[PDB]
Amino acid sequence: SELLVNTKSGKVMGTRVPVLSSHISAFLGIPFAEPPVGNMRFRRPEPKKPWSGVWNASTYPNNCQQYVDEQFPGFSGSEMWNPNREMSEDCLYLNIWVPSPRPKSTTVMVWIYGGGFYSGSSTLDVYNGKYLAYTEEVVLVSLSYRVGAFGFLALHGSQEAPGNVGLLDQRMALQWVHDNIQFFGGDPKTVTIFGESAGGASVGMHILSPGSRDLFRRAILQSGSPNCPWASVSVAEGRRRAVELGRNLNCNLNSDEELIHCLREKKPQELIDVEWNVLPFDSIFRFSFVPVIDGEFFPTSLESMLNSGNFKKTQILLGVNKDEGSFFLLYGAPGFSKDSESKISREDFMSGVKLSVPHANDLGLDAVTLQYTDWMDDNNGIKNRDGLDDIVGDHNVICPLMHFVNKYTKFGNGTYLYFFNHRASNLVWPEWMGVIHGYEIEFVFGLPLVKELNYTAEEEALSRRIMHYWATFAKTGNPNEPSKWPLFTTKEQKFIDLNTEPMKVHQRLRVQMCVFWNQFLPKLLNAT
Amino acid sequence: SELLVNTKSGKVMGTRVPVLSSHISAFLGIPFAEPPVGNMRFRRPEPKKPWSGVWNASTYPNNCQQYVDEQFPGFSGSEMWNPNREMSEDCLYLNIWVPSPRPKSTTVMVWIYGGGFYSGSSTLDVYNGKYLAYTEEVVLVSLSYRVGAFGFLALHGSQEAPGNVGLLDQRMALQWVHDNIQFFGGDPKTVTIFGESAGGASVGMHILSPGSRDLFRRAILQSGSPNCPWASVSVAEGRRRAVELGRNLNCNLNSDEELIHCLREKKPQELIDVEWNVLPFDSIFRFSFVPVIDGEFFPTSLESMLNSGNFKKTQILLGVNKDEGSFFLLYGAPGFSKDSESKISREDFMSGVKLSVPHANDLGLDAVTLQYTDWMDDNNGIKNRDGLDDIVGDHNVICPLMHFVNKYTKFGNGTYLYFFNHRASNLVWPEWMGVIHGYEIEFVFGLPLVKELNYTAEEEALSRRIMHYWATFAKTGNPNEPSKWPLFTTKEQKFIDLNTEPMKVHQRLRVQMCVFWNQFLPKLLNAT
Ligand SMILES: COc1ccc2c3c1O[C@H]1C[C@@H](O)C=C[C@@]31CCN(C)C2
Ligand SMILES: COc1ccc2c3c1O[C@H]1C[C@@H](O)C=C[C@@]31CCN(C)C2
Ligand SMILES: *[C@@H]1O[C@H](CO)[C@@H](O)[C@H](O)[C@H]1NC(C)=O
Ligand SMILES: *[C@@H]1O[C@H](CO)[C@@H](O)[C@H](O)[C@H]1NC(C)=O
Ligand SMILES: *[C@@H]1O[C@H](CO)[C@@H](O)[C@H](O)[C@H]1NC(C)=O
Ligand SMILES: *[C@@H]1O[C@H](CO)[C@@H](O)[C@H](O)[C@H]1NC(C)=O
Ligand SMILES: [Mg+2]
Ligand SMILES: [Mg+2]
Known part of the structure; x- marks a missing residue:
């Protein structure tokens, strides 16, 4: 049966899903790590022990524990990012959408969700991979990773809460895809990781981390880059925030061991209730627990790695939206x-x-x-x-990304830059917000192709070209089908606008x- | 006789001069101070001892000793600023153009020439006052003052070379006009001092100096203001430059008395030959000997005087040209x-x-x-x-002037601001220079009214309105004849363009x- 797949970790049983009057297979909730619960909270992830029998992968997994947005209770623009499954620390799973009939060796895309490293779910309606898998004939994977204190609490020097474990979760899922995607019809040598905001920063972090480079082929970064000012902290600042978290929960602070033990007995929601109290400044666009420049996952400072070409050299496709700050x-x-x-x-x-x-x-x-x-x-x-x-x-998204693309391009093998500036006709957020952080995702995942969602025919057409640009780039390292999206070069610095009007090429994005x-x-x- | 005038210093005999097919009287070369020669070099000026007999004032006086521009030998754009009379340290004289027949009590305008405080002459063809005196029926005076080391060498604490003596020369001429202009038909209570660049800075310095305020009624500043970065130095920097000048002439530097004695035996040209070697930096728009913030002529820093309203409160009219830096x-x-x-x-x-x-x-x-x-x-x-x-x-002329006008307006009694942007049709300087520092002067002195000079009919008309704006302001404190030049206010900050096109009002000049x-x-x- 097309819904049965035997992997190196065991047999998995998927489910058939309707898509635009056709159908494809979906394998939802495949475990890729052991649940990081109990004494495993804050620890590096452990690979999922193989299982006998058939894993039921017909339904979405739980979402990781996270701060839930209540700023606009019931408002759809806001609720669309909130967990839509029960939250649990047992949340390390991945999802796969597979064309029907099953491919033999096709292009693979792995989505890494954003959420400021403190929130996010692989199960959101805007990340439904069936449209892209179906339309472009790719095997689409969405992974998950621990966020907030559970994913990034960092007490450098300790092996119990070393920091960056959420990034190691992503890497473990990437290792699993590398080792098993062939069984689902995907070509593991043509894996493109793509993600938005903290997910785009994460993608750039795997391009930098020596231990992740070998697991994928090329990369797409949407409104995020590794060097964003909010995307990482020094080990000293990470340590300071972990100690302040313990201080908010009346933890014994005499040693790392004491602090960690105390933090491990607290229920998930207790850590989340005080998470935001550890920021050093009154600020916006700053999140409590994020990646740490540790000397392990990141061997040196991000800037010296960028400066010295110490990163994976391949093709990248990336860009930003017009009004990144309004949200x-x-x-x-x-x-x-x-x-x-x-x-x-x-x-x-x-x-x-x-x-x-x-x-x-x-x-x-x-x-x-x-x-x-x-x-x-x-x-x-x-x-x-x-x-x-x-x-x-400009400070948080655009200029850090322009700095990354210019440093990267000097050593890379091909760069494609875009500027997404289409305001969706059915946007529920007010007009003053414009083209909001995160709102190109629905076009990338093809939501405009479903009629009930109410997009214009031209929005459906924009979605189809974005999906084809993304999948063609994943397949070949070039979004163009052999009107051209030019290569971004150190000398010329060209990029294209991405909207419903005829393509325009410009240069030196917000120089x-x-x-x-x-x-x-x-x-x-x-x-x- | 109309050419004979008896003043408190003695009788003076002028000469009749043709002007635009008519004639007026001119009294050229009237002495207002004792020649500052010999042991008087660097000293404050002494008033001219009255003389018996008739002073022959039919010809222009000598020009003060100064660095002569040889950058473009024989080129008219350059030669028009060079001394056109023999240079001499005996140069403290003034000139008066008087309407014919002689007025009884009319509006008086006193011109103070520019030249970066190191050069300048009251006798230049572009400063010929006959056109303005004639056209607007004003008594026009042009004074002179010592420039360069002779006017501004400053060894603070010494009474022999205290600094600012060139400004005291201007003040002495203003005292003479106050005391005697009534005999030439001028109303000493309606004296407007006006000047360009270092002459405009000088005008603002008399507005600030307690000892000059009482000598005039209102002021016009063209492309200069007292606070310009090149217009003054601290007593320490002035002292340092005087000592460096002596060091260039192998002077005994053991004491102020030794340095000054040595500098007084040098011929004028010897001081001028090394004048430019004392600047502290490699720079442009910086001049060696300029006014000093001394605690006497300027009681405190210019900024605190401006901030506290410590200055003459009256009406001012001022402005800048479009391309102040090109020269x-x-x-x-x-x-x-x-x-x-x-x-x-x-x-x-x-x-x-x-x-x-x-x-x-x-x-x-x-x-x-x-x-x-x-x-x-x-x-x-x-x-x-x-x-x-x-x-x-912007750094040297415009922004310092905008800072002066905004500080001034808070305490003043009426401000009129202009932006001169007409490029003369017969300009001999290259096109890339635009509307050059100093090139509105010819319009202010009415040169466009003389046919042989080759201006367009519209340039003649612009000159006539500028002359009428300037003289009406001198007369009344408002350039408008009862299309309006609006008052510049703290709130609105309006100004007008000055050119051959219909007047346009704008706001916040280069804010x-x-x-x-x-x-x-x-x-x-x-x-x-
Ligand atoms: C710095 O990036 C973010 C920080 C916080 C949030 C989001 C971020 O990216 C946004 C779009 C998508 O990545 C997921 C969550 C976002 C929208 C929903 N909420 C409530 C918060
Ligand atoms: C800072 O102002 C100046 C500094 C130097 C010079 C001039 C300046 O103003 C110019 C126009 C007028 O004021 C007189 C001299 C100038 C034109 C002639 N030369 C050679 C030099
Ligand atoms: C898989 O799980 C779903 C819901 O939990 C259930 O309806 C479906 O029948 C299950 N399949 C098997 C055989 O476990
Ligand atoms: C990428 O690498 C191949 C050889 O390894 C080279 O021929 C090609 O030009 C490169 N492309 C770019 C844009 O650098
Ligand atoms: C005034 O001086 C000029 C030239 O020096 C001379 O021509 C004129 O006659 C003089 N007048 C008298 C009477 O001194
Ligand atoms: C100038 O002063 C007079 C009174 O001294 C006053 O009536 C007039 O309004 C003032 N003008 C301005 C523009 O301040
Ligand atoms: Mg915007
Ligand atoms: Mg210019």
Whole structure:
């Protein structure tokens, strides 16, 4: 039977799923690690012990324990990211969508979800892989990994909570795909990892980590890069946050062993209830437990690895969306609200910049404010609102990604850069938010091809070309089918817009602002 | 006789001069101080001892000793600023153009020439006052003052070379006008001092100096303000330059008395031959001997005087030209030449910024470069050339003037701001220079009304409205004849363009760049 597959870990039984008036096979909830529960909480993952009998893979697995968003109870724009399955620390599973009839050796894509390293699920409706698998004839995999303290609490030097274990979860799933995807019809030598935001940062982290490089062929990064300012911390800051977490739960802090034992007896929700109290600054776009520059998973600083070409050399396809900052300003900056046009006063602008660049001294905050203010019209509420969206987006997503692409391209084997700027016709978020962080995903997973979802015919067509660009790149290392998406080069720096209008090629994506964020401001903060 | 005038210092005999097919009286070369020669070199000026008999005032006086421009021998654009009379340390004289028949009590305007405080003459063809006196029926005075080391060598603490003596020369001429202009038909209560560049800085310095305020009624400043970065130095820097001058002439440096005695035995040209060797940095737009913040002529720092309203409160009319930096870049920055279009390489741009902001550290030079570079097109030769013109102009002329007008307006009694951007049809300087520092003067003095000079009929008309705006302001404190030039206010900050097109009103003259030069960069250099 097409729904039965024997892997090196055991037999697995999938289920048939309807898709656009046809059907494909799905193997949901395949375990790739031992449940990281009890004394295994905070530990590196262990491979799943092989099982006899048939694993029932007909239903989605539990989602990892995480902070649930209650900012807009019941609002769909918000609920679409929340766990849609019961949460459990027993959550290390992966999902596979396989074309029917079963391929022999086809292109494989493995999705890594985002969620600021503190949330995320492989089971969300926007990540349903049946459309992409079906439409492009690829074997589509979505993995999962521990988030929040469970995935990233780091007490460097300790073997019990070393940090980065969520990244090791991703790697273990990638090892499992490398070892077993051939049985599902996938070519393990043509595995493309792709992910958005913390998932895109994760993809870049596997490109950098010597221990992950050999497990995949090429990479796609959507609105995230490894060097994002929110994506990692030093071992000293990670240690400081772990100790502050213990301090919030009245833990014995005399030793790492004491702290970890205490943290392991707490129920999951108790850690989540105080997770946000350990940030060092009042800030937006900063998350508590994230990857640590540890000397193991990351051998040296990310910048020296990038500078010296110490990373996997292959082809990459990546990009950003037009209004990367709006989501975070809505959730945490003064003056923004979901149901108003959010015109921002001069004062709220200044407190927004302080929140956006938490690590900056006063001269630094002045430089940002000067750079983003139109001084002939400084009380313009729309301009201040949009200026803050650019500050947040440029500092946290865009300029770090432009820095990564320029460093990468010098040693890589092919780069394709995009700028996604289509505002979905059925977007439920207010107009002032624009093209929001995360909202290109639905186009990548082909949701616009299902009628009940209400997209325009042109949005369906944009989704189909994005899916074909992504799958053709996964297959060949070039999104173009032999109107061209040009290669991004060190000299030319070309990229394309991704929207419903005829393709336009541009150059040096937000260079002006990124020279400020990547070269000037760090020099300024260093001298002062 | 209309050409005979008896003043408190003695009788003076003028001469009749033809002007636009009519005639007026001129009293040229009237002495207002004792010749500052011999042991009087570097000393405060002494009032001219009254004389019996009739002073022959039919011809122009000698020009003060100064560095003569040989950068373009015989070229008219350059020669028009050079002394056109024999140079002599005996040069403290003033000139008066008087309408015919002689007025009883009319509006008086006193012109103070520029020349970077190191050069300048009251006798230049572009300063011929007959056209303005004639056309607007005003008594026009042009004074003179010592420049270079002779006017500004400063050994603070010494009474022999205290500094600022050139400013005291101007004040003495203003005292003479106050005491005697009534005899020539001028109303001493309606005296407007006006001047360009170092002459405009000088005008602002008399607005600030308690000892000059009472001598005039209102003021006009053209492309200069007291707080310009090149217009003054501390007493320590002035002292250091005087000692370096002596060191260049092998002077005994054991004491102020020794240094001054040595400097007083040198012929004028010997001091001028080494004048430029005392600048502290390789720089452009910096001059050796200039006003000193001494605690006497200037009681405290210029900024605290401006901040506290410690200055003459009256009406002011002032402005700048479009391309204030081009003249200085031509003369001293790499890549610029008089006979090429002067497209500037990225490299020459960077060495131009280093030359333009001599006092800045490397972070400071980076901030300027970032602010003026179009990073999507950084090798564009025209853009780099124009960017440098703006850097020089904004840092040295425009932003200091915008800072002065905003501080002044808070306490003043009426401000009128202009932006002169007409490129003369007969300009002999290359096109790339644009609307050059100093080139609005010919319009202010009405040269476009003389046919042989070859201006267009519209340029003649622009000159006539500028002359009428200036004289009406001198007369009434408002350039408008009862299409309006609006008052510049703290709230609105309006100004008008001055050119051959219908008047346009704008707001916040170069605010974006001036917030960088007046607020950001000084804070940056202070923190680093
Ligand atoms: C830095 O990236 C993020 C930080 C926090 C959140 C998200 C992030 O990326 C967004 C889109 C997708 O990756 C998943 C979660 C996001 C949308 C839902 N919530 C509530 C929070
Ligand atoms: C800072 O202002 C100046 C510094 C140097 C010079 C001039 C300046 O202003 C210019 C126009 C007018 O004021 C007189 C001299 C200038 C034109 C002639 N030369 C050679 C030099
Ligand atoms: C697999 O699990 C689902 C739901 O838990 C169930 O309906 C289905 O029949 C199961 N298959 C087997 C044979 O276990
Ligand atoms: C990628 O590598 C192959 C050889 O290993 C080379 O021929 C090709 O030009 C490279 N492509 C790019 C864009 O560097
Ligand atoms: C004034 O001086 C000029 C030239 O020096 C001379 O031609 C003129 O006649 C003089 N007038 C008298 C009477 O001194
Ligand atoms: C100038 O001063 C007079 C009174 O001294 C006042 O009435 C007038 O409004 C003032 N003008 C301005 C523009 O301040
Ligand atoms: Mg935006
Ligand atoms: Mg210019």
